[PDB]
Amino acid sequence: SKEYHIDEEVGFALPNPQENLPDFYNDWMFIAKHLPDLIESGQLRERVEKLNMLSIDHLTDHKSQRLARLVLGCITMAYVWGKGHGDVRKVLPRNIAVPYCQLSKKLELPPILVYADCVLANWKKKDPNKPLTYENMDVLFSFRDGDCSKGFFLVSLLVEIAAASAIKVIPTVFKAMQMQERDTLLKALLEIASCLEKALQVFHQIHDHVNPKAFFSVLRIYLSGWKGNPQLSDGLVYEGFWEDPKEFAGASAGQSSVFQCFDVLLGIQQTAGGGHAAQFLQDMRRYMPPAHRNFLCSLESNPSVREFVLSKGDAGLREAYDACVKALVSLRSYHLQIVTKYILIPASQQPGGTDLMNFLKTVRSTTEKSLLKEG
Numbered sequence: 001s002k003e004y005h006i007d008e009e010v011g012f013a014l015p016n017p018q019e020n021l022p023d024f025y026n027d028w029m030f031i032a033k034h035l036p037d038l039i040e041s042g043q044l045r046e047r048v049e050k051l052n053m054l055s056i057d058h059l060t061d062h063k064s065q066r067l068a069r070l071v072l073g074c075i076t077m078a079y080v081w082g083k084g085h086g087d088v089r090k091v092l093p094r095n096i097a098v099p100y101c102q103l104s105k106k107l108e109l110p111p112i113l114v115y116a117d118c119v120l121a122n123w124k125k126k127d128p129n130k131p132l133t134y135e136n137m138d139v140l141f142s143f144r145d146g147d148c149s150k151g152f153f154l155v156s157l158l159v160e161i162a163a164a165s166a167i168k169v170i171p172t173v174f175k176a177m178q179m180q181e182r183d184t185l186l187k188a189l190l191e192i193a194s195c196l197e198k199a200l201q202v203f204h205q206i207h208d209h210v211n212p213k214a215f216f217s218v219l220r221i222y223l224s225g226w227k228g229n230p231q232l233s234d235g236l237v238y239e240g241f242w243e244d245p246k247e248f249a250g251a252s253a254g255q256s257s258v259f260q261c262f263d264v265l266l267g268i269q270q271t272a273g274g275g276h277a278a279q280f281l282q283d284m285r286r287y288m289p290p291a292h293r294n295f296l297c298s299l300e301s302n303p304s305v306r307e308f309v310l311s312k313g314d315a316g317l318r319e320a321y322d323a324c325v326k327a328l329v330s331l332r333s334y335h336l337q338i339v340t341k342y343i344l345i346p347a348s349q350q351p352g353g354t355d356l357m358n359f360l361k362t363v364r365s366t367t368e369k370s371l372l373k374e375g
């Protein structure tokens with residue numbers, strides 16, 4: 001269990017992320033802390049180009065390697081996309097590419113910014129005695145003034161944490177199935193349903209803290225990758241680390257272990273078959289920290305909650321199971337509405353979206369198809 005690096009309070013998010021690196025990495029830290037200015041005034045690229053190659057060995061624990069991932073990943077996005085107006089670098093300079101690749105290998109993560117970087121590790125309490133609420137939180141790194149990264153990253157994080165309340169119930173679910181404890185099972189499912197329902201309310205804050213124009217035309221540009229991306233159709237050259245350019249997807253909540261873990265728990269077969277949706281979500285596992293990916297693997301290897309509940313002729317159980325599925329449908333439905341507002345409308349207003357809506361609708365529909373009764 002401790003092997004899975006799941007926090008009782010923050011779930012898959014990294015508890016108390018670190019904010020400073022050893023003095024030895026000030027050169028990295030200074031660029032990452034000043035990205036809005038450096039990018040805007042056109043100093044970012046030359047600074048990166050002028051860095052000495054720093055060794056990764058003075059990053060001695062997990063939290064500090066994670067902070068360096070976040071730093072280097074942000075710097076890399078800034079360097080590749082520049083001011084975010086379509087002029088793009090195709091080579092990442094060795095003095096940054098080499099340690100970032102080394103560090104990424106060590107953490108078993110791709111050398112690009114992932115969800116686990118810019119959400120799960122990218123946050124702090126303002127006041128350590130107050131609760132984890134938006135007003136008491138901040139992010140550690142942004143790209144551009146006005147990019148709304150704080151609102152986008154924190155509200156993801158807050159959803160992620162609300163859903164974590166349910167994660168701790170999962171061992172109860174499996175124990176109750178093996179012990180044939182019917183009332184314990186039912187209570188456990190109603191409790192998962194309740195947390196996933198809470199996570200929806202938390203989603204509503206996206207409208208308060210993120211503005212569609214700034215999201216669509218700025219933040220989205222900095223989070224994009226180089227896989228199947230025509231601005232970088234062969235990927236990115238990690239100078240000095242690989243000979244050939246490599247492709248990696250940009251940061252995506254398809255990399256959240258939260259939603260993937262409930263789809264597995266409930267037997268919603270999100271990654272089955274060979275369609276586009278299933279493959280993208282299977283591929284996104286390779287972007288999750290290894291401990292969380294081992295967690296998903298071990299969920300798949302347990303007996304099926306859905307089969308258990310379907311074989312019992314127990315309406316109470318059926319309805320508790322359906323309330324879990326329905327909570328996921330509701331969340332995915334609200335999310336589709338958000339995408340219409342934050343991507344589809346802004347895109348239509350500028351002087352593709354159908355493949356995106358269809359991907360999301362396929363995932364929602366596969367979730368709906370899992371309802372036992374129809375509700």
Ligand code: HEM
Pocket residue numbers: 155156157159160203206210215251252253254256259332335338339342343356360363364
């Ligand atoms: C402005 C707000 C948001 C926009 C524009 C948006 C956009 C998208 C897009 C474009 C995808 C497709 C895959 C990809 O391109 O990476 C997606 C998938 C997804 N998003 Fe968001 N998103 C938003 C907010 C959120 C938030 C707050 C969460 C909560 C953690 C979230 C969870 C997901 C998940 C889990 C998927 C994967 C498909 C699924 O499991 O249903 N999104 N989103």
Ligand SMILES: c1ccc(-c2cnc[nH]2)cc1
Pocket residue numbers: 115118119152153156223251252253254
């Ligand atoms: C950081 C936070 C959230 C996201 C995201 C939201 N929906 C899809 N990806 C991507 C990066």
